[PDB]
Design an enzyme around this catalytic site. Structure first.
Site, mmCIF file in Angstrom:
data_model
loop_
_atom_site.group_PDB
_atom_site.id
_atom_site.type_symbol
_atom_site.label_atom_id
_atom_site.label_comp_id
_atom_site.label_asym_id
_atom_site.label_seq_id
_atom_site.Cartn_x
_atom_site.Cartn_y
_atom_site.Cartn_z
ATOM 1 N N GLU A 27 0.768 -1.224 0.000
ATOM 2 C CA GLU A 27 0.000 0.000 0.000
ATOM 3 C C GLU A 27 0.817 1.303 0.000
ATOM 4 O O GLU A 27 0.275 2.346 -0.400
ATOM 5 C CB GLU A 27 -0.877 0.033 1.254
ATOM 6 N N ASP A 64 -6.444 6.573 -4.994
ATOM 7 C CA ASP A 64 -5.929 5.258 -5.142
ATOM 8 C C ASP A 64 -5.971 4.806 -6.627
ATOM 9 O O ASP A 64 -6.319 5.569 -7.478
ATOM 10 C CB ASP A 64 -6.582 4.320 -4.144
ATOM 11 N N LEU A 87 -8.989 3.960 2.770
ATOM 12 C CA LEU A 87 -9.944 4.596 1.908
ATOM 13 C C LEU A 87 -10.799 5.625 2.631
ATOM 14 O O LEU A 87 -11.362 5.366 3.694
ATOM 15 C CB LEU A 87 -10.866 3.491 1.328
ATOM 16 N N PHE A 134 -8.307 -6.596 3.073
ATOM 17 C CA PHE A 134 -7.983 -5.181 3.331
ATOM 18 C C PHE A 134 -8.150 -4.373 2.049
ATOM 19 O O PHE A 134 -8.640 -3.242 2.012
ATOM 20 C CB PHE A 134 -6.514 -5.137 3.759
ATOM 21 N N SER A 137 -12.179 -19.970 -5.750
ATOM 22 C CA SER A 137 -10.799 -19.960 -5.241
ATOM 23 C C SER A 137 -10.766 -20.351 -3.774
ATOM 24 O O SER A 137 -9.849 -21.022 -3.337
ATOM 25 C CB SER A 137 -10.263 -18.555 -5.317
ATOM 26 N N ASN A 153 -6.971 -20.011 -10.597
ATOM 27 C CA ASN A 153 -8.286 -19.440 -10.536
ATOM 28 C C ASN A 153 -8.215 -18.017 -10.008
ATOM 29 O O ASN A 153 -8.877 -17.117 -10.489
ATOM 30 C CB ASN A 153 -9.159 -20.309 -9.631
#
Ligand SMILES: [Cl-]
Ligand SMILES: [Cl-]
Length: 162
Positions: free
Chosen positions: A11, A20, A32, A104, A117, A132
């Site tokens: 990040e 972002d 965010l 996250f 998945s 996948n």
């Protein structure tokens, strides 16, 4: 290496409001603020989150504090999600960190939708799950980060982060 260090690498850290990869107002370590296209709306969310009139800038300590809260929330969100919990309980420590990173980034809701998945991960079919996981918008939009999280699931090691 651990979750915090891992997410700090994925990040980055910015002390002023920035947009972002999706063009949303964010701050700190991937925190965010809002999906709204108004900077003022973001500045407002920011002051509310920090508890002071920030003017769009925070200190390192403040960023780290939002970060701690955000990782704690992700974990707790996984644990309360009927779809995610069982997958998380089934994984080893390294792989759990990978599931946290995805939550996250994308929210638990987003992750809970990787039905196929998740099942592969739960069954410990590493190579199949990796394959996948890659057939996703997630992978196509943020391929380098995605490759890192996917290798983590594939291998059970932190090599993609070294
Ligand atoms: Cl908050
Ligand atoms: Cl990327």
């Amino acid at each position: 290496m651990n979750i915090f260090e891992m997410l700090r690498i994925d990040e980055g850290l910015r002390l002023k409001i920035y947009k972002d990869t999706e063009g949303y107002y964010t701050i700190g370590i991937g925190h965010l603020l809002t999906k709204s296209p108004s900077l003022n709306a973001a500045k407002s969310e920011l002051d509310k989150a920090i508890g002071r009139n920030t003017n769009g800038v925070i200190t390192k300590d403040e960023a780290e504090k939002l970060f701690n809260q955000d990782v704690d929330a992700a974990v707790r969100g996984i644990l309360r999600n009927a779809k995610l919990k069982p997958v998380y309980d089934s994984l080893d420590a390294v792989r759990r960190a990978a599931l946290i990173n995805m939550v996250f980034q994308m929210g638990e809701t987003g992750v809970a939708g990787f039905t196929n998945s998740l099942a592969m991960l739960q069954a410990k079919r590493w190579d199949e799950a990796a394959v996948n996981l890659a057939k996703s918008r997630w992978y196509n939009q943020t391929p380098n980060r995605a490759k890192r999280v996917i290798t983590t699931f594939r291998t059970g090691t932190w090599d993609a982060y070294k």
